[PDB]
Each structure stands twice: as C-alpha cells, then as structure tokens.
Swiss-Prot record, chain A:
Protein family: Belongs to the venom Kunitz-type family. Sea anemone type 2 potassium channel toxin subfamily.
SUPFAM superfamilies: BPTI-like
Gene Ontology molecular-function annotations: aspartic-type endopeptidase inhibitor activity; serine-type endopeptidase inhibitor activity
Intrachain S-S bonds: C3-C53, C12-C36, C28-C49
Keyword hit for Disulfide bond: yes
Site, Reactive bond for trypsin: residue positions: L13, G14
Compartments where found: Secreted; Nematocyst
Protein name: PI-stichotoxin-She2a
Species classification: Eukaryota, Metazoa, Cnidaria, Anthozoa, Hexacorallia
InterPro entries: Kunitz_BPTI, Kunitz_BPTI_sf, Prtase_inh_Kunz-CS, TFPI/VKTCI-like
Species whose genome carries this gene: Stichodactyla helianthus
Function in brief: Active against serine, cysteine, and aspartic proteases. Can bind vertebrate trypsin and chymotrypsin.
This protein's record includes keyword DNA-binding: no
Swiss-Prot record, chain B:
Disulfide bonds: C30-C46, C127-C194, C158-C174, C184-C214
PROSITE patterns (alphabetical): TRYPSIN_DOM (PS50240), TRYPSIN_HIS (PS00134), TRYPSIN_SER (PS00135)
Keywords: Calcium, Disulfide bond, Hydrolase, Metal-binding, Protease, Secreted, Serine protease, Signal, Zymogen
Gene this chain is encoded by: CELA1
Positions of the Peptidase S1 domain: 1-238
Annotated catalysed reactions: Hydrolysis of proteins, including elastin. Preferential cleavage: Ala-|-Xaa
Name of the molecule in the record: Chymotrypsin-like elastase family member 1
Active site feature: H45 (charge relay system), D93 (charge relay system), S188 (charge relay system)
Binding locations of Ca(2+): E59, N61, Q64, E69
EC code: 3.4.21.36
Amino acid sequence: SICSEPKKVGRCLGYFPRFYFDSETGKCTPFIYGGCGGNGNNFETLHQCRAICR
Amino acid sequence: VVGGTEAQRNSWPSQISLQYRSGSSWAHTCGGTLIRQNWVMTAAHCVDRELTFRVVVGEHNLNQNDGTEQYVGVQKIVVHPYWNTDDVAAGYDIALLRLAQSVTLNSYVQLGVLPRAGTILANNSPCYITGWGLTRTNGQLAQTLQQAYLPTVDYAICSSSSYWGSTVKNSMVCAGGDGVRSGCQGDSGGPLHCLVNGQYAVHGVTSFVSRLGCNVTRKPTVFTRVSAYISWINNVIASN
C-alpha cells in the first residue's frame, strides 16, 4: 500500500513537519519533509496516519 | 544553514520568513526575497499547496519581537506553470507572492537587487546563503538568521559526474559543496546573495540538495537561477 512505503524526505529544502509509519519501530512518527517528491507514507496529520494505516 | 554563523541583525534586509497558519499562530517553513513593496519571490515547492501563508519582513529572531518586523498576509500565489513537484531537478522552482498589504520600506526592510537577464556567474564567485533552516542534521529551525559563505560552482564543474551530473540545468546555480557549509531544511525559497558590480544581488532562490544530506562534499546546494526568470518576474508583477 502506502504505509509500507519508505520514509522519504526528498531533495527540497523546505521545512514541512509530517508523519510516517515506521517499520523497524511500528508506530506513526514525526519527520521533516523537504516539500517536493514525497511518496505515500507522508501524512499532513497524525490522525491521517493512524486512520490511514494503524 | 549548516556551517554558518548568526548574521548581524537586519544585515540582509530583503530576507523574508515565509510562515503557514497553525492554530491561531504561524510557523516558519521557507525563506523568500522581498522584490517589490508588495511582492515576494520564493520557491515553487514552498507554496504549491493549499495552506494559508504570511510573510515576515525585518525579521531576525523567530520567537521574539524586536521592533523591526512587519507581518503581512499573502494575497495571491503565482507558481511557475512549468514547475513539477515530482521533478525538482527539471527546474522552474520559483513562485511569486503578492502581499495583502504593502510593507513599509526602511533601513531594515529593503528590496532585493536582482541580476540583469541572462547573467551567469564566473566559477567560484563569492556568495552568501541566508536563512532560518536547520544548522545540524536532525536539528530544529535556527532561532536567529544564519549566513554562510557559499561560492559558486560553474555549470561545467557542477554538471560533472562527481558533482551533480545531469541533475543540474543551466537554469540553476550551484554553490558550496565543500562538505562544511550548505543550505538545509527551512532555507528553501531564500536568497543566494552575490556581490557583483558593487552591490549584493540575489542570484539564487534556494531549491534543493542531495538526498544524501544537506551538507555533502561535491553536492553543492542548488538554487533557481534568478537571471533566467527576469522577464517572467516582471510580466507577472505587471499583470497580477
């Protein structure tokens, strides 16, 4: 799906706080997204992440 | 900015902080350059999204009001129509923001001087990057505006296989890549300031770095080349 996709920061230098589902750990987790080229495991809200894959 | 130092306050008076609405407050996400009393030049990837933005001019410390700041809403966002979010290396990473009210120009708030159309810098030209971006891997945004000396790497060197290869286009400026200093998350959209013919001109709009990391030897920070967009910039402002 998308929850199995890797965390991806991307090449851009924006500061966008987002959340991803962590594999080695098992929980939705904050990260800084750069603002371009994001993939599916990237949710604007923590509630999106949980509903989406949890 | 990684490997930099705190700028003298208000020493880069065209630098702006671009912030998105959060609750009833505001949070920094990108830099920008004031180019008219009511227009700001930034990166497309900063604003190609449905957020409510504001611009802060005269800023130095993000979490303390010192008295030089003016806080204005964003009225209109004009993303370059060729910008592609899935391909930053294709270029066109530029956007213009019209402000909901004009800022007042003073010693602290000044227009950024732009290069003449088509200007290409000689290799190793002296430039400075500024911003409130990260200063270390896994850090927070900087509290105070930072600067770093970031000399240019010309298209010929930057396009070589040990640098950026085909990723870089002629419509971009490469700077840095020494493994000590670079832009980092939060610096996007901001200026690369270059001293040319006796004034600091804004030759770059901070765009991207290698996915390897912000500060990586032979992976210079990459900027949109402002001089390639002068006619586009002037026409958008004249029309919008």
